Amino acid sequence: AMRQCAIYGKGGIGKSTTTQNLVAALAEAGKKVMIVGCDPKADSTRLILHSKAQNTIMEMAAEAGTVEDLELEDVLKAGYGDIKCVESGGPEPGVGCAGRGVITAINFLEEEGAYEDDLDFVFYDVLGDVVCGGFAMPIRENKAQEIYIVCSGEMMAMYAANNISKGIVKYANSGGVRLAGLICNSRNTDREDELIMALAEKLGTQMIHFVPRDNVVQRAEIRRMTVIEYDPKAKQADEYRALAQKIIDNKMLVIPTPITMDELEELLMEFGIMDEEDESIVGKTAA
Amino acid sequence: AMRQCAIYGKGGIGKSTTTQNLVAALAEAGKKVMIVGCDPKADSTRLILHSKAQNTIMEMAAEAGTVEELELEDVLKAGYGDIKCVESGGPEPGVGCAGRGVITAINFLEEEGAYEDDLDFVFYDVLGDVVCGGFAMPIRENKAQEIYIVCSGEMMAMYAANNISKGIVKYANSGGVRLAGLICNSRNTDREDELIMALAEKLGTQMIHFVPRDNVVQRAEIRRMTVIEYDPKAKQADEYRALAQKIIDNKMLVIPTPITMDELEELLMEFGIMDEEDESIVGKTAAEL
Amino acid sequence: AMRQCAIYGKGGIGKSTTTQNLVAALAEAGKKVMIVGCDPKADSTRLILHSKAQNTIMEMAAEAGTVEDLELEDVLKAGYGDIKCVESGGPEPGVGCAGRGVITAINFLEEEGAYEDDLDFVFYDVLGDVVCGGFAMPIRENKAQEIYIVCSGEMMAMYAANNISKGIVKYANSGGVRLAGLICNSRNTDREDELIMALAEKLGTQMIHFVPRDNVVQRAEIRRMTVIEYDPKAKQADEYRALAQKIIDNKMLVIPTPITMDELEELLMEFGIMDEEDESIVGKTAAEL
Amino acid sequence: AMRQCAIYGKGGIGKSTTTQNLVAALAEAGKKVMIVGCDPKADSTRLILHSKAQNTIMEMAAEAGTVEDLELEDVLKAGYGDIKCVESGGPEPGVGCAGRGVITAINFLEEEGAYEDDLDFVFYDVLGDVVCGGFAMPIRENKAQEIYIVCSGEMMAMYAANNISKGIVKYANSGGVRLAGLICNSRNTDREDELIMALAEKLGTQMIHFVPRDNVVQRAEIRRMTVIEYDPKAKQADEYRALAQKIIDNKMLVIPTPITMDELEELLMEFGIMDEEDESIVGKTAAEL
Ligand code: SF4
Ligand code: SF4
Ligand SMILES: [Mg+2]
Ligand SMILES: [Mg+2]
Ligand SMILES: [Mg+2]
């Protein structure tokens, strides 16, 4: 029973670093895992491979003309703990949709039997900033059943988490896409955990883990590796094992209940992220 | 002589706040301006209208028909300096295309006569992060002739500027969509201005204005207004006026020259945005070494 | 019973702002309070007087000849909630001892009957980075019997908290000086509450209150006033009222048990303030690894 | 001709890091340097010695019983480039004076013959926050002719630089103590470089060098070393060399011109560090609008 998961979140909150660290922890737990990158704005395999930038399917397509000309050897590389790594390749700037690329790639792996192994998990690393048809393609085509959202106590991070839930709600009726949990990439802020726990509560889900900020992540990042690999004894390592072990044991798969912009702002203000609004100063000149 | 302009850039660097502030400067200078928010996940008109969120074209279409049903009066609101304000609205989570929404909005506004009315400038506030077919829709359909790029001295904001320039290069043989300059939104970091100037020379453009950080910006955003409106005497207010001025007189429209990822890494690593790599230590564990 | 208190801690963590907000909360609870400024690098009475820089006893005495020509009225002002405010004035650069100016202030206040019987609290706002002889004067001279340490999760603020504790141990069996509690000035950090509680655990004291980081404090600071006065219906206001009340009902005075530098580092590493060291690569050049 | 210098500056701005990387660049250039640490809150020698904590004169003397039965080998350690490293030790918490232990350390080093013929520089690393008599001890005793003030474009760092400048003025005629320049220790901020030069112009001095923020410094420090030793190929290394070279070549030893607090505020404001004071809201309640 291979589990088809995806990680969704906006960019610039460390979504990909967490994806790779968690996956490494799976490999260290003796799970066989594939990472499929579906994010143009981040490398989703660099830390597993030790590479700078894996060649994507989209740019290897030009090398021979079409994806039917491609060998699976060129696209799918093995790295740490024999984690299987692939990068779809983002759209050509101005002349491409991101759904089409991710379809192209997922069917290529299907045709070539990448999904035909003793594979325990596949994790699609997906950009979930602006949740259009394109980035919602793994959901729509039912290519990921278990969605995890990487977010944080930042406004836009939680907005993204809310739209991602909405996107899910769309194709919930159709296919078995569910929300597995929220993952908090800490910003080393106070009450951030509680914030996301309360957001989870309202979404009808769970904060499956709080991922702290810890310099050992960056120290592993310099060496193009995960923390699991770099330093198994780091206290950060137990943090990714906890997340990983919780995903494995996870049986909580819901249809989320998105929230309103006021219902959100209410959260922000409750946990001291946003301040209580004051209309007496609204529209009022300094003179 | 209406000039159709777009501001492209990524989220989280205050693109919209610069657009609103810029536009308030123009109105204060006596120009008539319309703003078409084409950024999902951004309130592009909130400072002009003193509103928490404008009604978006896409969300009122949720009723039925982004045409007919929708009335320009329920779409287009005037605000500070008689600035006309429109919010296209983002795509339906999971289903719709963002560019399809934007064009529909723009088509609606054409079809309802908004682009008359004695307009000196219209500004499209467009998301330009992952510049897909979607967000390059206003370029392909030549809905904006001049493109300004909001960027900061940050990896991703500079990679977006790059992808925005590739998208302009893709359609420069079709239409007359040209890059007008980079606007740098400060992160209050050393050497940021030099960084962007270097990006400009490579992209084949100019850093048209350096927009400093200043608490008077947030102070005005809190009150849901621009600095130009909140305190025109402020020093930050003079900066937005200078931006507005250089845009009015801007005579430089170019086909940019996108750089390669190595050339981009070369540039970060000059200004220390990226660290120099010690590749001897790559793949090495804490125990080994 | 006029409780003779002192706030100690290093600069740059908002010690003073907490003191004044705290003392504002006491004077709103109908208390009679005197703040004596014993910190050269902080205006300890600015927010109470709505004043830029209160004139110090050392400044005034020089423009007079001596502390004997000095009138009480130029040196002790009443502010919000009729709080009495005094500023000792730090040492003359290069010559004077921070302590000597403090003792002059205290003797002048004692000489001129500034310490009234009705008074419910005196707070000394004392610098507490380097806990030398000069800055431990209140404690040596038995003027400060109840010490509150304003700290935070940054190393120097905690090291300083430990050094102020060692200062207390010295005079605890000469006079009745006791540590009353730690006061966390939050840097909007994760686990910072748990850190100071665990520091207090080791010291024998308690973390009496955690003061949040809230922008209304800054909004109030800017207007040279406390949150108690600026906006009583603010949530931060309730946070100072909490602190003040806990202070009012505090019966836990103790002799602290300072900790080894090894123990301190054990705490910072456990709460992520210090990094776990990679001792193998110590002293190694990047060329040799 | 040995040159007796001193690095004054406030805590927490990486003064001692700059000191040690500076001496490394002097040593790389074949100069004989001794670092004498006079900071209670900092290791002035750890990066040279690759050691967690050098034993101080205070504690070593505390062990023996007096400083007359203390051997030179015990305190004076050699490190990278055979830089001589010494640590005065801070004051006995609550009782001690910081100037007592520094005069002690200097007399010992004198008698034991640590100040050798071959030595080209000695540097005292003194905490320069509150410039009392005790911390001005190297100046008063005329043990430091050249003073370099580390600072940054921040209120309190510039204030401390100001107070140090008054400390020099005081003993300027008596001794031969001059100010040699400011060293800006970057916080990666805009206009900070323009600010410290402007301060320098008001003190009647110069900015000798602007030290960038660069992660390599922390990469070196984690391994308990200077950049010069970590990686002499890094752009930072050259920065420490430029600083060191300019110091070697420096011919600008002045008596400073300290500025008023108002003058310092005018500088902060001119370079966007402070906002202009809105006196129209000082005293004013939130509800009072
Ligand atoms: S559907 Fe989304 S990814 Fe595809 S072109 Fe439109 S905006 Fe871009
Ligand atoms: S006791 Fe403290 S304040 Fe007094 S001179 Fe010595 S170091 Fe300075
Ligand atoms: Mg090791
Ligand atoms: Mg007396
Ligand atoms: Mg190397």
CSV table of C-alpha atoms and ligand atoms in Angstrom, one decimal, chain C residues 106-108 110-111 143, ligand 4:
chain,number,residue,atom,x,y,z
C,106,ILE,CA,20.5,58.8,47.5
C,107,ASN,CA,22.1,60.9,50.2
C,108,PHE,CA,20.7,64.1,48.7
C,110,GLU,CA,17.6,61.3,52.1
C,111,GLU,CA,19.0,64.6,53.3
C,143,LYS,CA,19.0,50.9,49.8
E,4,MG,MG,22.6,60.2,54.0
